[PDB]
Design a protein around this ligand. Structure first.
Ligand code: 2GO
Ligand code: CLA
Ligand code: CLA
Ligand code: CLA
Ligand code: CLA
Ligand SMILES: CC(C)CCCCCCCCCCCC(=O)OC[C@H](OC[C@H](C[N+](C)(C)C)C(=O)O)OC(=O)CCCCCCCCCCCC(C)C
Ligand SMILES: CC(C)CCCCCCCCCCCC(=O)OC[C@H](OC[C@H](C[N+](C)(C)C)C(=O)O)OC(=O)CCCCCCCCCCCC(C)C
Ligand SMILES: CNCCOP(=O)(O)O[C@H](COC(=O)CCCCCCCCCCCC(C)C)OC(=O)CCCCCCCCCCCC(C)C
Ligand SMILES: CNCCOP(=O)(O)O[C@H](COC(=O)CCCCCCCCCCCC(C)C)OC(=O)CCCCCCCCCCCC(C)C
Ligand code: HEC
Ligand code: HEC
Ligand code: SF4
Ligand SMILES: [Ca+2]
Lengths: 38, 145, 35, 35, 854, 193, 50, 50
């Protein structure tokens, strides 16, 4: 029975999540965007 | 459901020799100890005359590269057989008291870091997987008492 | 003496701080009951 | 200077994700139990 | 139920008076025995250790006293039959033993006399009392009934048996006596002034420590007669641990001059109140002892808290405790590491405990007086502003809700930062984020010539990046000397010899030529990773401490800064010259380069010596707030910032139930909405209606405050004792803490394990550990929603046992009924068990010794 | 619990030692009893029993912060190290009883799983003194702060680790009842350290 | 650990403490019925399972 | 055993999460639900005022 307000919060937390993942797994498995490589 | 498998990653192993899985080799005792004996002795000479042509020459290439980084082989401090040298204080791996009072995990960092004055650090010479193999070979030197 | 006075004043200012905060909430929500 | 800014951004995101997640647990608790 | 409710207020003045006097006499007797247990024939224990630094500062305990005594007051003093000074003539006694003995006997004689006199006021109140009711287990002895039926303390008797001839204070016609508690406020503080004078005269003339500015030019020491300013600590003013002359108000002669300063002030404020005693309408209801009891007990609690803070700072580095570290302290056969700081920490944490317990209890006793006003219909009639200011329920919900919010935000900030940096120190990969550790690599001196293989990116700033290993012109992987690292380089974790971070491969250089603001005087390449070192600055106390300190030390700070700047330039030019050497290619060009670093070596040496010595000086400047184990400046740490946020947030978490006691003892907003009213101050619930209602009463709110406060109290214990509170997993021996000159014993969880290595060395400490753990978890049997189960099952047990008794013939078993705790008495004993279980274990953390580096 | 502790052993004097120096042992600034009735017996007695280097040490003096405290640079002079058995015993038993008993036992034969056992001859013969320093300084095994054998490079000084090294060689060939005594240290030192 | 399971098997409706009072447990998961008789939390079958 | 557990950073993360799940059960098991209901109610009023 979710609100728009809540959906939107959920989208915003999905973004942080994926932004984080991209930074963690993209340089490692492609050897590019080398500022986030570890 | 959860572990759809389990995402633990791919295993780190040593160098690849064509036609013979290195990852597999790193869990198969008779393969890993053959590479440990080569590192330990600094030559391929004490390897079973049954060794294949490709194997015998891959080892040599491994040694030749390590000789350019001033790698010092384990035998001959510690000898080809253990139980080193009292002169140099080089550890005797044949001794059961030395073997009981070491864990294999603990032994690892003493090879990585070196140990007091003379036993050299191997962290910049060898990979941590090649140190694991050597800890396993040193285990087989033990004698009773 | 210096450290003693600082600590003491920092605890006393911890209470004084809170009251001020509470005073701001009370004044600026006068005429909204909280039911 | 630039490490610091980068670190502040990660910490913000963590607070947004953990506090954000906690409140979603409450909302979800609320929808199940009732409204 | 009522067994702990025997004596409830209001009481009459003579009965309170008399019991206080009797308790005072009793304490004086216990202290007298503690004086006997301080004598030098005994082992060190916790009781005699917590008094020895004070008895050293007083001159009564003398550490350098070796001679044995054989005649001192009267001709019978080596040793003799039936002791000669009973049970003590067995051992060699010194003069400090005799000084101790005498002060013991003096405290036992005064105490017994005060106990007698208190009893005279207490029982002569009631017109007397018979010997068998005073002692009460004296009529059980046979052939001594007649003895116990005499009447002592009678209003009538001959001089050695009077109590109160007039019956009460109110009836006795001495027209000096004040007649109301506000009027008595004036004589009570003149009286306390007089006590301050007594102490000052005892210190000046009995203990021989006159007041500043009248201290002697000369004082006797074990090495002869010396001048006050060179005589070491117990004798004179020279502090032999810090190597300084003490400030005059940091000696005991300072404390004797304050005896007179405070005594004059109390006498004058008491004479002012004699003439204009307090009279406000806002005060008049406070004559009822139930109401004042709240005021006084909560004030006293605050006084204890302030004793803890004041005593901790004032005495952290004082020679009375450090002197303990020089004696050869052995407890249950061990040998303690830094006993000075251990006993100092015990005394201050003792006081913090007492602080909490009395603020919480004082407020509960407050809520009892208010609840009774509500029961009796008088709350609505009350006239004092100190009640009526808070009568409005809409204001009460705004007070409670905004302190809940302020608590929420400070505790989320602190606990969230702890969680973050423990993630960072552990290198945890979450899929969406890789946490990264702090690592450092020295770039200067000899270390700066060790090489590594470097993966070096092409252009960090643009994506569709790429990198490559650093090579030679022929194509082999070249070794990069730590002096030549750059921001963005990656070095393999394995080659730095790091396991423990298996989810990634490289460490990244994030800053080069880094010099700690406060730490080692070295130059590093660093990975900052996720480690928030800037968070130390998110502390108002960092800035105040460092500002005062900079203002006081500004010239050596300026010369240090300038010596650092000169060394950095000289190191940078050395690295140029070393690089020209390494990249020569012509045996001539090599040789000439080598010639020029050789003639620049001296003066790199000089810039490094200069920098080292200025840094050593700067780090020897006196502390303001944050100190070393010496008494030198340290910069604030992440530890100190987290402590700061945790004190704000965690004391609000603990004290919110006290506000609820104050406002909602009778009706809260939940209650008022249903029209309910709390009928007593201690009911457990009213049952399952509306979901469940356990735990709303003011006695229960009291228990919640105490449990919740366990949390700020453990943060204080961990901080006092040298734990790191800013993460959970921190170890003392790691790169961040050694490069920044930080000593700690732990990391929240990691402290628990690490200190217990020390606890395990002591068999008496481990037996305490076992027991205190048994006490705590049994509290869960009493706090869980479980009492019906327990009563139902205890009924099954009763039945079985009575069956056995009928079958077996055992008359005493045939009517057995096991008692099962009802709900209120369970919550009380469960809280008692939970609290004593935890804080016997916290005692152990202090008692293993103090292990922070000095 | 309180008061009825025992009588103190007459051999443990309380007669006071000199205070720990404020100056760092690693300072480049300026470098590194009476006749009263029983004061000479008490000083002579403190000179054997009361330890001088038991207290945690200044932070600039810890082995990781000392320029000559790394395993590669420390001086293990055998003449200074095995010079005085009183001293090895006075110091190493206090340090060992405090820091090392927890994991290695009250007998020094091993408590924590896989922990060392210092009485074992095979272990004694195959370790250098410099080797023993390395493992105290580094720890043993992989982990944060050392492994299951924790690192001491923040924590202890180079001089404190050296008393530990000499004390540990008194464990050789002893039985599993507590720690080496004063005469174990002395027979160890006579048989060339 | 298994005496609560025997209590489930025999005392799901009435224990002997309930039966002296005439009580009757009305469902398998109720939390209590107390503060009566000192309090009754934890007599249901669900609680005996826990 | 925990000195061996500390040498693995994945197992020490598991150790931390495990401890937190447990002591929170005490919030739910103590005789305290009325206190939690009446405080929650103060919290709701306050948030609605904001
Ligand atoms: C570590 C070695 C050893 C082992 C064998 C051990 C095991 C266990 C077990 C088990 C089966 O393994 C259990 C079940 C257990 C139980 C207990 N132990 Zn325990 N225990 C040991 C040793 C000790 C010791 C010495 C102590 C406890 C103490 C305690 C206590 C804990 C009492 C309690 O409930 O305490 C809450 C407080 C805690 C956890 C301390 C928090 C410290 C921290 C610095 C506070 C600041 C930061 C926080 C994140 C909070 C911020 C927000 C806030 C301020 C509002 C009970 C008996 C106890 C204690 O922590 O009391 C506060 C104590 O002193 N224990 N303990
Ligand atoms: C801090 C949180 C944390 C992190 C970062 C990890 C990370 C890891 N876990 Mg642990 N784990 C945790 C907490 C964590 N876990 C907790 C609370 C439990 C108890 C439920 C476990 C129980 C656990 C088991 C039993 C195992 C791991 C394994 C793993 C690994 C592979 C995980 C994976 O495939 O995910 C993807 C999978 C999901 C997201 C769910 C499917 C990885 C090292 C595996 C491993 O072998 O590592 C050594 C493994 O077997 N996890
Ligand atoms: C020390 C641990 C401890 C012990 C010994 C007990 C004992 C018992 N509990 Mg309690 N309980 C505990 C903790 C413990 N509990 C905890 C932590 C909780 C919360 C979850 C509970 C919650 C609880 C519930 C809801 C109920 C019980 C019940 C019972 C009884 C079970 C009936 C029986 O089978 O007899 C067998 C008896 C035994 C197996 C115990 C032998 C006794 C011990 C080990 C000796 C005790 C030593 C004692 C600590 C030392 C202090 C003594 C001092 C003088 C030296 C039993 C007497 C039931 C009951 O019937 O109530 C009356 C019940 O319904 N328990
Ligand atoms: C297993 C139980 C046990 C044993 C055998 C001891 C033994 C002792 N305790 Mg410890 N103690 C214990 C439990 C124990 N305690 C518990 C549970 C606590 C927490 C309340 C303490 C708190 C404690 C303190 C604070 C002190 C000791 C002290 C002592 C010693 C003097 C005892 C004494 O005077 O007794 C006579 C005692 C009575 C006759 C009861 C009064 C003795 C070594 C003293 C000491 O210094 O130790 C080295 C001391 O200062 N006890
Ligand atoms: C983690 C432990 C924890 C936390 C965070 C809380 C939180 C709270 N308790 Mg509960 N409680 C606990 C454990 C906890 N409690 C335990 C062990 C007991 C047994 C005694 C209780 C018993 C209990 C009672 C009887 C009562 C409460 C009440 C409260 C509230 C006080 C009102 C307030 O102060 O606002 C300030 C808020 C804070 C200070 C906390 C901020 C949020 C925290 C820090 C972190 C969130 C952490 C969580 C573990 C994260 C998981 C998130 C997920 C995304 C991973 C607050 C919501 C009172 C209340 O009003 O009821 C609602 C109350 O009456 N507590
Ligand atoms: C228990 C659960 C509830 C979760 C708890 C843990 C949660 C971890 C915290 C996660 C924090 C989120 C990280 C967000 C973030 O900014 O970090 C990722 C970021 O990535 C940047 C780039 C951006 N492009 C490429 C899109 C332009 C990317 O990867 O996509 O790099 C950083 O922020 C690194 C910061 C540098 C540190 C110095
Ligand atoms: C605080 C300590 C320092 C000790 C205090 C003094 C006593 C120490 C030694 C133990 C004393 C044990 C006495 C137990 C006893 O006899 O209890 C009887 C009692 O009451 C019933 C009648 C009185 N009606 C009820 C008639 C008025 C009576 O005897 O006086 O009880 C209780 O109801 C309490 C329960 C006592 C525990 C006894 C249970 C013993 C276990 C037996 C189980 C197995 C069978 C088969 C042997
Ligand atoms: C290993 N050694 C660590 C300490 O080294 P070192 O010597 O460098 O430094 C002082 C800190 O030691 C203290 O001095 C603690 C004493 C604890 C007893 C004292 C602990 C009591 C603290 C607070 C008591 C609160 C009570 C009264 C509610 O480091 C300080 O700066 C502490 C200053 C404390 C002031 C913080 C201010 C916060 C405000 C609180 C508001 C609360 C309310 C609104 C409800
Ligand atoms: C009857 N229905 C009506 C209401 O009942 P209601 O809740 O009032 O009643 C009782 C009694 O008040 C006590 O509570 C007595 C202790 C007070 C001073 C105490 C007197 C003696 C004990 C303490 C003193 C001993 C020392 C000083 C000699 O019912 C109970 O609490 C019954 C439970 C106790 C039965 C023993 C259970 C285990 C024994 C303790 C072991 C636990 C340990 C591991 C810590
Ligand atoms: C206090 C300072 C000490 C001293 C002087 C020593 N220890 Fe320990 N230790 C522990 C474990 C698990 C081992 C085995 C390590 C392994 O093989 O896995 C050890 C080992 C040692 C050694 C031998 C080192 C060597 O290379 O051979 C030495 C000299 C040593 N220890 C001395 C465990 C722990 C602890 C548990 C946490 C603690 C604390 C200590 N040790 C402390 C000390
Ligand atoms: C001499 C020049 C050496 C070469 C080459 C190698 N090692 Fe060594 N080692 C040497 C000495 C003098 C010592 C004694 C160390 C000391 O205590 O002072 C050792 C020690 C070891 C040990 C035992 C370590 C332990 O912790 O207890 C191992 C496992 C060991 N050495 C292994 C080893 C390996 C695998 C080497 C080649 C890869 C190797 N050593 C080289 C001397 C020398
Ligand atoms: S379980 Fe106990 S506290 Fe909870 S509603 Fe029932 S009687 Fe009340
Ligand atoms: Ca401690």
């Amino acid at each position: 029975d979710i609100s728009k307000v809540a959906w939107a919060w959920f989208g915003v937390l999905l973004a942080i999540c994926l932004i984080g993942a991209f930074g963690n797994y993209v340089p490692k498995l492609f050897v590019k965007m080398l500022m986030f490589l570890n | 459901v959860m572990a759809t498998g389990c995402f633990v990653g791919a295993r780190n192993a040593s160098e690849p020799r064509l036609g013979s899985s290195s990852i597999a080799a790193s869990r198969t005792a008779p393969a890993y100890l053959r590479e440990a004996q080569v590192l330990y002795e600094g030559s391929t000479d004490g390897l079973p005359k049954d060794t294949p042509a490709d194997e015998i020459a891959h080892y040599k290439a491994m040694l030749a590269e390590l000789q350019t980084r001033n790698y010092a082989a384990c035998a001959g401090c510690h000898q080809v057989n253990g139980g080193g040298n009292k002169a140099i204080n080089a550890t005797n791996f044949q001794d059961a008291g030395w073997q009981a009072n070491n864990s294999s995990p603990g032994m690892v960092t003493s090879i990585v870091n070196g140990k007091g004055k003379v036993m050299p650090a191997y962290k910049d010479k060898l990979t941590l997987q090649q140190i694991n193999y050597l800890v396993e070979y040193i285990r087989r030197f033990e004698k009773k008492r | 003496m210096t450290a003693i006075l600082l600590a003491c004043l920092f605890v006393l200012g911890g209470y004084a701080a809170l009251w001020g905060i509470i005073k701001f909430v009370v004044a600026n929500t006068k005429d909204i009951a909280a039911n | 200077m630039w490490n610091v800014v980068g670190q502040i951004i990660s910490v913000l995101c963590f607070f947004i994700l953990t506090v954000g997640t906690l409140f979603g647990i409450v909302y979800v608790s609320h929808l199940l139990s009732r409204g | 139920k009522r067994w702990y409710q025997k004596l409830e207020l209001p009481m009459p003045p003579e009965r309170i008076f008399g019991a206080h006097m009797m308790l005072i006499g009793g304490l004086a007797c216990l202290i007298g025995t503690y004086f006997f247990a301080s004598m030098t024939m005994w082992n060190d224990g916790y009781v005699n250790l917590t008094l020895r630094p004070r008895l050293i500062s007083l001159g009564i305990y003398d550490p350098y006293d070796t001679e044995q005594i054989q005649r001192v007051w009267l001709p019978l003093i080596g040793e003799f039959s039936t002791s000669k000074l009973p049970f003590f003539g067995q051992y060699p006694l010194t003069m400090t033993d005799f000084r101790l003995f005498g002060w013991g006997c003096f405290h036992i004689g005064l105490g017994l006399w005060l106990v007698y006199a208190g009893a005279a006021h207490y029982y002569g109140a009631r017109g007397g009392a018979t010997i068998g009711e005073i002692f009460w287990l004296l009529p059980y002895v046979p052939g001594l009934k007649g003895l116990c039926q005499i009447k002592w303390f009678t209003p009538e008797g001959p001089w050695y048996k009077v109590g109160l001839p007039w019956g009460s204070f109110a009836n006795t016609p001495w027209p000096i006596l004040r007649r109301t508690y506000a009027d008595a406020l004036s004589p009570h503080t003149i009286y306390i002034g007089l006590l301050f004078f007594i102490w000052g005269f005892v210190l000046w003339f009995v203990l021989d420590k006159p007041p500043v500015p009248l201290q002697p030019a000369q004082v006797m020491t074990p090495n002869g007669l010396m001048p006050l300013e060179q005589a070491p600590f117990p004798y004179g003013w020279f502090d032999p641990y810090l190597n300084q002359v003490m400030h005059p108000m940091n000696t005991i002669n300072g404390e004797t001059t304050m005896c007179f300063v405070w005594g004059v002030l109390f006498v004058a404020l008491g004479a002012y109140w004699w003439y204009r005693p307090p009279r406000s309408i806002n005060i008049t209801h406070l004559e009822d002892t139930k109401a004042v009891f709240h005021v006084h007990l909560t004030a006293i609690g605050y006084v204890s808290f302030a004793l803890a803070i004041v005593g901790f700072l004032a005495l952290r580095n004082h020679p009375s405790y450090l002197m303990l570290n020089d004696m050869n302290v052995i407890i249950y056969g061990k040998k303690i590491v830094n006993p000075g700081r251990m006993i100092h920490n015990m005394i201050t944490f003792n006081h913090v405990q007492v602080g909490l317990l009395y603020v919480a209890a004082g407020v509960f006793h407050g809520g009892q007086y208010l609840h009774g006003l509500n029961i009796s219909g008088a709350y609505k009639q009350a006239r004092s502003k100190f009640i009526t200011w808070f009568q409005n329920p809409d204001l009460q919900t705004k007070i409670v809700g905004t302190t809940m919010f302020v608590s929420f935000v400070t505790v989320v900030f602190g606990y969230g930062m702890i969680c973050w940096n423990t993630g960072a120190e552990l290198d945890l990969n979450f899929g969406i984020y890789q946490f990264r550790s702090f690592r450092a690599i020295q770039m200067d001196g000899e270390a700066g010539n060790i090489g590594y293989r470097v993966f070096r990116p092409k252009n960090p700033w643009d994506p569709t990046a790429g990198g490559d290993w650093v090579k030679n012109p022929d194509g082999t992987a070249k070794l990069v000397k730590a002096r030549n690292l750059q921001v963005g380089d990656r070095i393999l974790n394995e080659e730095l010899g790091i396991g423990s971070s298996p989810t990634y491969s490289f460490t990244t250089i994030e800053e080069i030529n880094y010099k700690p603001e406060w730490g080692q005087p070295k130059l590093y390449a660093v990975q900052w990773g996720s480690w928030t070192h800037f968070l130390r600055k998110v502390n108002p106390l960092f800035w105040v401490d460092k500002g005062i300190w900079y203002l006081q030390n500004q010239k050596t700070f300026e010369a240090t800064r300038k010596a650092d700047e000169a060394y950095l330039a000289a190191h940078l030019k050395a690295v140029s010259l070393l690089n020209q050497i390494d990249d020569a290619q012509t045996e001539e060009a090599k040789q000439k380069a080598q010639a020029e670093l050789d003639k620049f070596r001296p003066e790199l040496e000089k810039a490094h010596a200069n920098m080292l010595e200025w840094n050593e000086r700067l780090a020897s400047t006196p502390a303001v707030l944050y100190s070393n184990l010496r008494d030198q400046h340290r910069d604030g740490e992440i530890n100190d910032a987290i402590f700061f946020w945790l004190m704000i947030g965690g004391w609000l978490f603990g004290f919110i139930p006290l506000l609820r006691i104050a406002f909602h003892n009778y009706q809260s907003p939940w209650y008022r909405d249903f029209e309910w009213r709390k009928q007593s101050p201690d009911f457990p619930c009213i049952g399952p209606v509306k979901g469940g209602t356990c735990g709303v009463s003011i006695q229960d709110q009291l228990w919640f405050c105490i449990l919740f406060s366990i949390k700020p109290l453990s943060a204080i214990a961990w901080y006092l004792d040298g734990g790191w509170i800013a993460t959970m997993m921190a170890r003392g021996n790691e790169a961040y803490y050694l490069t920044h000159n930080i000593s700690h014993t732990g990391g929240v969880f990691l402290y628990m394990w690490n200190e217990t290595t020390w606890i395990w060395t002591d068999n008496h400490l481990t037996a305490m550990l076992l027991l205190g753990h048994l006490i705590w978890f049994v509290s869960f049997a009493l706090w869980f929603k479980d009492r019906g189960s327990r009563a139902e099952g205890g009924d099954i047990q009763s039945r079985w046992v009575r069956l056995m008794g009928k079958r077996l013939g055992i008359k005493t078993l045939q009517e057995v009924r096991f008692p099962v705790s009802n709900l209120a008495t369970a919550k009380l004993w469960g809280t008692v068990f939970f609290y004593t279980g935890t804080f016997v274990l916290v005692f152990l953390y202090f008692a293993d010794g103090f292990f922070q580096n000095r | 619990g309180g008061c009825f502790v025992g009588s103190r052993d007459p051999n443990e004097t309380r007669y006071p030692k000199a205070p720990m120096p404020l100056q760092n042992q690693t300072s480049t600034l300026k470098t590194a009893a009476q006749n009263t009735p029983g004061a000479r017996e008490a000083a002579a007695l403190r000179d054997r029993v009361t330890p001088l280097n038991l207290q945690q040490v200044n932070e600039q003096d810890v082995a990781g912060n000392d320029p000559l405290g790394s395993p590669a640079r420390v001086v293990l002079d055998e003449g200074e190290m095995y010079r005085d058995p009183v001293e090895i015993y006075r110091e190493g038993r206090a340090l060992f009883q405090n820091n090392c008993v927890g994991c290695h036992g009250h007998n020094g034969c091993g408590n924590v799983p896989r922990s060392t056992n210092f009485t074992d001859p095979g272990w004694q013969e195959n370790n250098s003194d410099g080797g023993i320093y390395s493992s105290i300084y580094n720890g043993k095994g992989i982990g944060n702060g050392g492994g299951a054998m924790p690192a001491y490079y923040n924590q202890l000084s180079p001089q404190q680790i050296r008393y530990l090294v000499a004390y540990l060689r008194a464990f050789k060939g002893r039985q599993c009842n507590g720690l080496p005594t004063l005469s174990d240290v002395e027979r160890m030192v006579a048989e060339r350290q």
